[PDB]
């Protein structure tokens, strides 16, 4: 956790890009099957 | 007539790359350029054949050939750079150490 915070401080742009890409991959991996099941 | 003209142009470009390789004895970058001209002729042939035959395989494989040609050009210019740095010159007589 401490190392993660240090890395986010030192390199904020790569952390932001990683979070955005993780969200973009997470929407169709989980939310898309959830919506398909709901429909 | 259009197919005849396109095929003739592509074959002429292929022969012109062959001629570039033939004439450029002490020139090696132009040999690579003639190889790239051969690649361009191949791509043009694939595209015109796809158009004439109403099949999409030619376009797919022309795109893949473009990607491969770009990658091989990158690698080839890397080899050229490292060779020129090693021997300080691009002359052919300095690249004849193996026989």
């Amino acid at each position: 956790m401490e190392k993660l915070k240090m890395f986010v401080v030192q390199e904020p742009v790569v952390a932001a890009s990683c979070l955005i890409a993780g969200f973009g991959l997470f929407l169709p991996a989980v939310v898309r099957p959830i919506l398909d099941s709901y429909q | 007539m259009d197919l005849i003209k396109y095929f003739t142009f592509s074959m002429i470009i292929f022969i012109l790359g062959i001629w570039g390789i033939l004439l450029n004895r002490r020139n090696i970058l132009i040999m690579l350029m003639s190889i790239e001209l051969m690649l361009l002729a191949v791509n043009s042939n694939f595209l015109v054949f796809s158009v004439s035959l109403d099949d999409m395989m030619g376009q797919l494989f022309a795109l893949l050939v473009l990607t491969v040609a770009a990658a091989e050009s990158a690698i080839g210019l890397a080899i050229f750079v490292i060779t020129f740095r090693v021997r300080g010159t691009i002359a052919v007589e300095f690249i004849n150490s193996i026989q």
């Binding site: 401490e2 915070k5 986010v8 904020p12 | -």
Partner: protein, 70 residues
Amino acid sequence: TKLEDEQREQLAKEISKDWSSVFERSINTLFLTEMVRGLMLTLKYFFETKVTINYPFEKGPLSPRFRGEH
């Protein structure tokens, strides 16, 4: 350079005390807060009055103890 590396690690630990602070720093570096503030000051001076003297008709102030032409 080992001293520099350990100083960098100590500073990173110091300025990463909690998630609130790290998130604030990351957002400030990502959303260009200082750039926006500089732009706002620049816009204020764009909209403020000018100090150009309009040379041939308006001339700069002088003093009686001025050293001009002998």
